[PDB]
Amino acid sequence: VKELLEAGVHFGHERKRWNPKFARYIYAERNGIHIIDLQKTMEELERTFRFIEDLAMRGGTILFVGTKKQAQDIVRMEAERAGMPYVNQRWLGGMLTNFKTISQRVHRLEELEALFASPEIEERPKKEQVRLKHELERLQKYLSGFRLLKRLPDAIFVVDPTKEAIAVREARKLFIPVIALADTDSDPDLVDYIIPGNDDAIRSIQLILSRAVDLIIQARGG
RNA sequence: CCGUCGUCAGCUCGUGCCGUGAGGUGUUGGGUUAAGUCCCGCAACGAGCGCAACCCCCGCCGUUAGUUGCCAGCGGUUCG
């Protein structure tokens, strides 16, 4: 799929906190705010989306990451739609470098889910009960989407690259491709497949991700 | 084998990350606790030794048990 000239939604976000390297993606300043040149965002989308089709039909896995408060309720949604994994609540340092050590945390969920169905529930100390009840509680937060990761992902779809420069760092080191919805404040020089655009705006995050996923699905043929 | 700091709440490790390196991070900060007790947060996620917990006494109650116990209810007293 392709997009329209939907310009009533992305056309810049941040004030004057920008990163000089982003210049290549700005139109001009208006009322002290940078405005992204959309004619250019179209040139980038037409490539990034290419990458995803490639990935998708090749049957790949894209980890969706966005710890921003605004994208919270969106990230959850979209990933769930492919079969994609995602990082909603908070991004754990090493969910990719130290994966084998974290995937261990995953098994801890697996093993607890089990106990809370089996007969060994109320039967045994209750102090531990609470103690164990809380552990799932926390897991069913952070790991909620990571769970789907059988092995490290073929690409990451990050939202605020500068906020998730930890995730990006990691990936960058493990040679996993980076796809992010970036703008004024990011270092484009580190994002394999950029998507220059506003993002605090639900209206922006929502569009950028939906059109991506629709790409994802139509790619596999559903 | 014991005294002692000290029943104090600490002491550390794997892997990850930071640093040429000694080392650091985790264990920290904000809240909380009797406690590194727990919450929130954070390049960390866990784990070990320690805290706690499992064990004994005390306080309520139940079941099993009646040569301690009692007119608690009845019959006699040298009415103990």
Curated annotation (Swiss-Prot):
Keywords: Coiled coil, Ribonucleoprotein, Ribosomal protein, RNA-binding, rRNA-binding
Gene: rpsB
NCBIfam families recorded: rpsB_bact
GO cellular component labels: cytosolic small ribosomal subunit
Glycosyltransferase found in the keyword field: no
Family: Belongs to the universal ribosomal protein uS2 family.
InterPro entries, per the entry: Ribosomal_uS2, Ribosomal_uS2_bac/mit/plastid, Ribosomal_uS2_CS, Ribosomal_uS2_flav_dom_sf
Function: Spans the head-body hinge region of the 30S subunit. Is loosely associated with the 30S subunit.
Alphabetized HAMAP family for the sequence: Ribosomal_uS2_B (MF_00291_B)
Protein name, UniProt field: Small ribosomal subunit protein uS2
Domain of life from the UniProt record: Bacteria
Molecular-function annotations in GO: rRNA binding; structural constituent of ribosome
Any Gene Ontology biological process: translation
Coiled-coil ranges per UniProt: 98-143
Quaternary data: Part of the 30S ribosomal subunit. Contacts protein S8 and may contact the N-terminus of Era.
SUPFAM superfamilies given in the database record: Ribosomal protein S2 (SSF52313)
